[PDB]
């Protein structure tokens, strides 16, 4: 397989790891902060997906510094990863057009 497809897949694997690790660490960081909602695993994992996609529902968010750090890693992971998929798709389209052009 071509690099850009491997990378896509790799990123997917990397993203899912980040989501899991992140939701587990988020709960760890948040319990002990009064008023915190990011304190059970199930909804923390859902919070990971919201965060990495930037879906923006605003129903859960971290209030501690370390929870916020965790969140930044998940945003960047998500944004980069999905951006990588666009790159991978552009590489395919570009290769195809060279062919269709006789180049």
């Amino acid at each position, epitope marked *: 397989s071509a690099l850009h497809w491997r990378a896509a897949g790799a990123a997917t694997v990397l993203l899912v790891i980040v989501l899991l690790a992140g939701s587990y660490l988020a709960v760890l960081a948040e319990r002990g902060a009064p*008023g915190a909602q990011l*304190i059970t695993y199930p909804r923390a994992l859902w919070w990971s997906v919201e965060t990495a996609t930037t879906v923006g529902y605003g129903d859960l968010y971290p209030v501690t510094l370390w929870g916020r750090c965790v969140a930044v890693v998940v945003m960047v992971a998500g944004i980069t990863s999905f951006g990588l998929v666009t790159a991978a798709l552009a590489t395919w389209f570009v290769g195809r057009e060279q062919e269709r052009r006789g180049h």
Partner: antibody
Amino acid sequence: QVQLQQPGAELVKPGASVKLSCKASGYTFTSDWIHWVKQRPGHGLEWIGEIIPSYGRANYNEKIQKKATLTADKSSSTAFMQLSSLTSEDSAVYYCARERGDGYFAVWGAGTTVTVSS
Amino acid sequence: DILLTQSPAILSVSPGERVSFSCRASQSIGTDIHWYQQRTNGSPRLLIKYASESISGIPSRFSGSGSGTDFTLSINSVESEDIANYYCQQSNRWPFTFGSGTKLEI
């Protein structure tokens, strides 16, 4: 089988300090939290604090005077609450419970009756 | 702390009747409420979780309802073994908290 094992009782002298134990069995997860709950005779339930043993991070009820220190021993899967400089105020049953990081106390220990007198 | 209010403290009903305990929360907590039974000398026993979800080993006649700030624990057809204290407990926000307790008597 029984999952949380606490000693039945502990006599303690004013000013002294006791270390209660809570011995776990059944499905362990590293995502498991152990909680400690205080019940004075007549009164209801009162959350004291929590620990995630597979990490040692403990959080405490900040609304009340801190008498407790939480620790665990990963190998014997036993959680220890260390109550110190006690007074009659601290005479109560102390339960420990287990939570799978989903917010509810599935199982509870049978409780340890800490009595504080000379 | 989220405050949970269980009022009245004592509920008195007749054998086989249906009974409802309420838990009111000081702010809105979805369905993150859990119900425990404690008989004289016993330790608490989880009856219902997340407002309405049943637990293995609990009689069918226990059920729960509510969301937000209003919650209800119901027993279809009360009977002697149900005589106990009943507590609610929230997991929406840290720390977890407990209701003051309601005692059922027949």
